Design an enzyme around this catalytic site. Structure first.
Site, PDB file in Angstrom:
ATOM      1  N   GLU A  95       0.826  -1.447  -0.051  1.00  0.00           N
ATOM      2  CA  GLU A  95      -0.097  -0.153   0.210  1.00  0.00           C
ATOM      3  C   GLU A  95       0.315   1.191   0.274  1.00  0.00           C
ATOM      4  OE1 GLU A  95      -2.643  -0.239  -0.327  1.00  0.00           O
ATOM      5  OE2 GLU A  95      -3.258  -1.780  -0.147  1.00  0.00           O
TER       6      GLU A  95
ATOM      7  N   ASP B 193      -6.906   6.179  -4.621  1.00  0.00           N
ATOM      8  CA  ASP B 193      -5.823   5.134  -4.605  1.00  0.00           C
ATOM      9  C   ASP B 193      -5.796   4.605  -6.675  1.00  0.00           C
ATOM     10  OD1 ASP B 193      -8.119   4.609  -5.298  1.00  0.00           O
ATOM     11  OD2 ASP B 193      -8.567   3.353  -3.501  1.00  0.00           O
TER      12      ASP B 193
ATOM     13  N   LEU C 184      -8.968   4.134   2.909  1.00  0.00           N
ATOM     14  CA  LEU C 184      -9.936   4.516   2.180  1.00  0.00           C
ATOM     15  C   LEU C 184     -10.297   5.957   3.156  1.00  0.00           C
ATOM     16  CD1 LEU C 184     -11.639   4.784  -0.769  1.00  0.00           C
ATOM     17  CD2 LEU C 184     -12.704   3.028   0.822  1.00  0.00           C
TER      18      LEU C 184
ATOM     19  N   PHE D 173      -8.250  -6.576   3.415  1.00  0.00           N
ATOM     20  CA  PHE D 173      -7.853  -5.432   3.435  1.00  0.00           C
ATOM     21  C   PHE D 173      -8.559  -4.434   2.576  1.00  0.00           C
ATOM     22  CE2 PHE D 173      -4.713  -2.068   6.067  1.00  0.00           C
ATOM     23  CZ  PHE D 173      -4.448  -1.404   5.323  1.00  0.00           C
TER      24      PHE D 173
ATOM     25  N   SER E 147     -12.500 -19.962  -5.657  1.00  0.00           N
ATOM     26  CA  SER E 147     -11.015 -20.031  -4.807  1.00  0.00           C
ATOM     27  C   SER E 147     -10.820 -20.320  -3.590  1.00  0.00           C
ATOM     28  CB  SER E 147     -10.445 -18.673  -4.957  1.00  0.00           C
ATOM     29  OG  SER E 147      -9.937 -18.272  -6.608  1.00  0.00           O
TER      30      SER E 147
ATOM     31  N   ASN F  91      -7.128 -19.968 -10.488  1.00  0.00           N
ATOM     32  CA  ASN F  91      -8.446 -19.089 -10.482  1.00  0.00           C
ATOM     33  C   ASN F  91      -8.536 -17.523 -10.439  1.00  0.00           C
ATOM     34  OD1 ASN F  91     -11.651 -18.874  -8.165  1.00  0.00           O
ATOM     35  ND2 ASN F  91     -11.863 -20.111 -10.788  1.00  0.00           N
TER      36      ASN F  91
END
Length: 162
Positions: free
Chosen positions: A11, A20, A32, A104, A117, A132
């Protein structure tokens, strides 16, 4: 290597409000602020999150505090999610960090959407799972990050990060 270090690599750290990859207002370590287009909205959210009048700038300490809260929230979301919990319980420590990373970034809900998955992770089918996972908007919009996380699911080592 651990989850904090992993996510700091993915990040980055910015002390001023920025957009972002999706164009949303964000700060600190991937925090965020709001999905809306208003810079005002964003400043407002930031002030409320930090508890002070910031003019859109924060300190490093303030950035780590948000990050610590954000990592704790993700773990707990996982742990309180019907779909997610069984999977997390089934994984080794490294692979657990990789699921926390996804949560996250994309939220409990978003992740909970990777049904196939997830079932594959529960059965230890690392390669089928990696294939996948790649078949996703997530992989196609943010490929270098998604490659990292995925390799981590595949190998159960931190090599992508080292």
């Amino acid at each position: 290597m651990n989850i904090f270090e992993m996510l700091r690599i993915d990040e980055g750290l910015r002390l001023k409000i920025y957009k972002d990859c999706e164009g949303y207002y964000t700060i600190g370590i991937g925090h965020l602020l709001t999905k809306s287009p208003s810079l005002n909205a964003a400043k407002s959210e930031l002030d409320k999150a930090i508890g002070r009048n910031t003019n859109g700038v924060i300190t490093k300490d303030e950035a780590e505090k948000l990050f610590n809260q954000d990592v704790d929230a993700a773990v707990r979301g996982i742990l309180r999610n019907a779909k997610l919990k069984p999977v997390y319980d089934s994984l080794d420590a490294v692979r657990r960090a990789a699921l926390i990373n996804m949560v996250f970034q994309m939220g409990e809900t978003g992740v909970a959407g990777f049904t196939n998955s997830l079932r594959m992770l529960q059965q230890c089918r690392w390669d089928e799972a990696a294939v996948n996972l790649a078949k996703s908007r997530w992989y196609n919009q943010t490929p270098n990050r998604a490659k990292r996380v995925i390799t981590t699911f595949r190998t159960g080592t931190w090599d992508a990060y080292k």
